[PDB]
Amino acid sequence: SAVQQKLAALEKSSGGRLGVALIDTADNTQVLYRGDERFPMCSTSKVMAAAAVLKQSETQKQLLNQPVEIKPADLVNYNPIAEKHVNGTMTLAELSAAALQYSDNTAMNKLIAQLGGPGGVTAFARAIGDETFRLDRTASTLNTAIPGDPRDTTTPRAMAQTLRQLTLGHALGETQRAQLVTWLKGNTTGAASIRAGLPTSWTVGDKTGSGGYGTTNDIAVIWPQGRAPLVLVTYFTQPQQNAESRRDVLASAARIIAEGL
Numbered sequence: 001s002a003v004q005q006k007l008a009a010l011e012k013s014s015g016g017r018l019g020v021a022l023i024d025t026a027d028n029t030q031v032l033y034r035g036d037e038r039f040p041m042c043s044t045s046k047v048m049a050a051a052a053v054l055k056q057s058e059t060q061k062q063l064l065n066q067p068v069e070i071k072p073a074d075l076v077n078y079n080p081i082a083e084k085h086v087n088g089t090m091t092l093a094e095l096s097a098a099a100l101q102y103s104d105n106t107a108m109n110k111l112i113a114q115l116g117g118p119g120g121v122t123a124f125a126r127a128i129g130d131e132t133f134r135l136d137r138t139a140s141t142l143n144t145a146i147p148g149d150p151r152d153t154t155t156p157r158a159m160a161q162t163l164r165q166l167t168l169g170h171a172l173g174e175t176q177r178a179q180l181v182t183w184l185k186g187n188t189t190g191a192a193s194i195r196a197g198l199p200t201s202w203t204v205g206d207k208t209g210s211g212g213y214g215t216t217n218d219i220a221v222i223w224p225q226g227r228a229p230l231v232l233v234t235y236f237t238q239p240q241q242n243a244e245s246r247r248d249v250l251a252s253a254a255r256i257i258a259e260g261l
């Protein structure tokens with residue numbers, strides 16, 4: 001189709017490897033580009049960890065309100081929220097918001113720990129029917145994005161389906177589903193990625209990721225005017241370890257989709 005050719009041209013112009021999955025919930029049509037190839041997730045895995053804690057809170061009533069100590073050993077590279085609470089506490093709700101809306105890596109690691117480690121995040125993925133997602137390491141290591149390394153990867157097709165199930169489907173209870181969507185709509189890190197390729201009147205909830213090898217990712221639920229919601233996953237990675245981020249490539253992918261379908 002014309003969209004897949006435009007995505008192939010975008011990829012050629014980029015010098016990298018582009019993976020796209022769009023789900024149009026109006027008729028459940030799916031458009032894939034490298035949709036079954038594995039990409040490093042980087043920080044887009046924070047949605048699965050936040051959703052896993054929300055799932056836990058369906059049966060542990062006041063779980064999201066529980067305080068979690070932030071200790072010196074918890075501090076990592078990038079923790080713009082958690083560093084302000086070292087030797088203090090944050091609630092699991094606050095850690096979820098910090099992970100999703102600021103991509104705070106200390107916050108993510110507190111969620112992973114709350115789930116029993118990377119294997120607990122993965123086990124939740126399996127519980128909601130995602131057999132492709134794998135989380136193998138904590139937040140510092142998970143962004144290394146070395147080519148050929150299957151750790152901390154998924155495919156565009158799998159992540160779009162999972163994001164659909166979590167935000168538009170029935171993977172979470174209704175209060176939890178709404179809270180996840182509220183957090184994604186308040187993301188602060190996504191203006192240059194999928195959002196930049198979409199009309200400004202469309203509502204977006206998204207989670208970005210960035211990592212080594214110029215890896216630049218964004219996963220989004222989109223509510224256009226005049227049509228049913230869309231789920232869009234855009235993954236991108238490059239051959240040089242120190243390649244620069246290409247959020248503009250993600251925005252171009254979104255524009256192709258928004259104009260072409």
Ligand SMILES: *C(=O)[C@@H](NC(=O)/C(=N/OC(C)(C)C(=O)O)c1csc(N)n1)[C@@H]1N=C(C(=O)O)C(=C)CS1
Pocket residue numbers: 041042043044077078103105139140141142143144189207208209210211212245
């Ligand atoms: C998730 O993707 C996180 N990414 C990182 O921790 C890394 N940021 O490095 C970049 C390339 C952004 C940098 O400025 O050097 C990273 C690269 S290699 C490594 N081990 N970690 C968070 N997510 C985002 C995001 O785009 O959502 C960031 C902007 C960085 S923190």
